[PDB]
């Protein structure tokens, strides 16, 4: 049994909401969830937290732009700000806990935020994990990542059932999928959400290329990668892994079946034990 | 410790000649090697075999055209007919062991003729483990694969050395090289294995089309595959285990580092742990 | 030993500062940087200025929109009125001089100003030299010109650094890499150069193709070109420099190796004895 | 003034029948002639011989299936073969001469055999440079090389003149000539020489793919090779020279005007020194 504390805590300019969880004496790992409406931390991690606080530091915060975190006084036009906030909000964060290296692990969004971070500051992390990560360049956008991108043209709740739906392999049988979606579909739709979310979205939509790490730069990195996608994943593409998967110094890929976007959730019953291996060791 | 036995065995109208190993009660495995001058199951997998052993009933054998396996009267020009009789060979091999239901491997040409074993007697076997296969259609065929083929028109030592080398990621450390190498090479040559081996990669080469499991048939296949790729394999492209992957019924695809076409002795350190545990449950 | 003169000079309409040095009575060349945050013509040629100074008299102008030159009043939304103001500060220049004819020598943006220079006032200019050149078309651009143009999204000094690496080939040795990066990135900050800086890269992204020379008229330029571009060059594709050295009447193409996009900084070894006898005869 | 030795040596199997010059004391560089009806070392090297020998000992073998050199028995069907040949005629001819290590240099299918060499045996070679090579990727074969090696299907003079001019940038011009033509038309209709020269060309045209070097090859070559390509080379496009200059460990690119497929010809004006230099150093 494990306690999940989760509150706010200073991460620099400004303050993030966190889950931590696990004995401040073992590794780090920094999990970073991915974007959409409604996400947040707890959404992306909450579930497996206790298995990884069994050896590790957990710390899972709320991206800036999402959750309780601070957010910004403006709101930036160009996506690359906000992933410019969100590697200065995880560094503060690891400052203020006084940790010096930590495993980081990043979903789709977050792998963006994760390749950004080990890119400017390698030193600081040891061994990384991406799953249906985006900081690659993309075939052919599939239709259900057009129709995420312009959910607020059309905020309604079936629409955003769907959404969801297409977020896992198996809908009907993903435990806590309609209180998910409920629950979820409030917040996003809050004023001050819809509000900052509209103009992020925008900023995700023409205007990701720029989020692409050079194939130099991947073939640099010192870390040892391990790649994750579901051989199902509706919103991102494999051609991302492939790509990270071809130019990175030391990587390996994994495709899980019977799994959609969030592998962590719907095959962490081999994902898991890998993770451990591949931090433990 | 474990004892081999490589012996003749009667599989039908030729006979094969077959490595060995386990006790019989426990399940079967059969370890289908690639093609290539002087290909053979030894080569392929005796260092890998006690492993497998210890939990399993091991058999690998010589396929027909290599080793010391039964050679055909008359010599097909035709690459399937070279298939077909494989095809036989393994299940006549399966019949004089008694083994009704067995777990299969096969890696680069011996994956063609696993695909084609489960297509045609689903279920003779349980469960299905692929490496760098070519049962797939290939995106263009790799300078190294090419120069493979047409090995006979000048079948000097150095060529064929710098042939063997781009198998594996790193030559100069693997153990056993210079003399897989020099021993191969003199084999490669017999006036009867050239023979046979010329005719085989003419056949190989340009007419392997035909070798294309139909996708339509890959996602009706009820076994679970493992599919297998070294991010450094010069040989067989990834494409090949991408298609396979894409379309089977239940797959999963684990592409390792600092692997080259030859996996399973490459990284046995990765995959050895990966096969008990597909095959085991 | 050469002293080099650094001041305002009046280059017509707008004043230029530039970087002079050398016997006004030897031929004249005119060295134009690229472009960039920071960018300025003491960055680009100080270093390799004393070497043709020996020979030539050497004329190096911050060209508008960079350095300390005069600053138009309105700043124009279209690149092409910024290239046209660059040209008319040159020959305003060279009329200043009273340089009737001079050889040019252009780097990667100020090789698009180069080319129009040569194509307007072809009595003007003898022989020319273009390195990592941008006036044509680019197959793809690469990550890093993208995110090269995106900087002032995320002006930070971690991003910076990373930018500037990516322009040699290897930042580690490269002599004054930390202070360059230091210095340039308090210039390229500071909120009046931020602020014409931000107008520039937003008309060279979605702008660039009106920079495009028409082969047409590469094919009549009666100069003698050398083309150079550096093997690792991650900012230029080699795309550009084989269409100019394709459709020239009279071109050289001289591909450097262990060489970025500031090939004069990096293999001055090879460019400077190359460029004096490419001037001298 | 330097004194050319041309005779027949003993180089292993088959003996070689070579231009010799310079004193055996200098370093040694060994000249590789490209293919075509009548083509032979003396063609291809003479007229800059002696400028090499000044510095370097020279050797210029007419490689098997040219010139005066000893033909094989029986007449190989596969390109392979013959290239095979050549390794081994190479090797064995800086044997006999007690060279142990020699620069090479390589024109279009000299190119291919230089490429096979210093990859068999990379410690007996220095310094490389190649010109309109071809041991690379063709985007589409030009009309004037399909023209070539179809010759025997029209083996008139005419034709010929036309073939030979093709090769150069300014046949008008070019000293030699029709000298040139009507002596090597001579001797490409030798009932002999066209007869092996016909199957040469039917094994060169459909067979030329297994000629390309893979790049991971090109890659691990450890010395520096200096490529050389006429802008108006009309038999070899420039993109094999290109494809090479991608993928070696260590390379540059030179494209020189006004000059052909004859580049050590054309331009020895600029292209002597630069081997000079690249030797020398």
Redesign the interface.
Known sequence: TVEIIEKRFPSGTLASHALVAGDPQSPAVVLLHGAGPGAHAASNWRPIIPDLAENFFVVAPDLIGFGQSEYPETY?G????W??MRV?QILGLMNHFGIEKSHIVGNSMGGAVTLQLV???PERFDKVALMGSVGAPMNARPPELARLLAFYADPRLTPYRELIHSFVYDPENFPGMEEIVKSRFEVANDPEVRRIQEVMFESMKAGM??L??????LGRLPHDVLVFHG?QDRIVP?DTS?YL?KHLK????????RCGHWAQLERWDAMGPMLMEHFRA
Chains 1, 2, 3, 4 share one sequence.
């Open positions: 930036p160009h996506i690359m700000s992933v410019g200065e890119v400017e500051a290329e720029s692409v790490i050079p194939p130099a730069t051989r494999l492939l998967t030391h990587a390996e890929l994994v495709v899980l079946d």
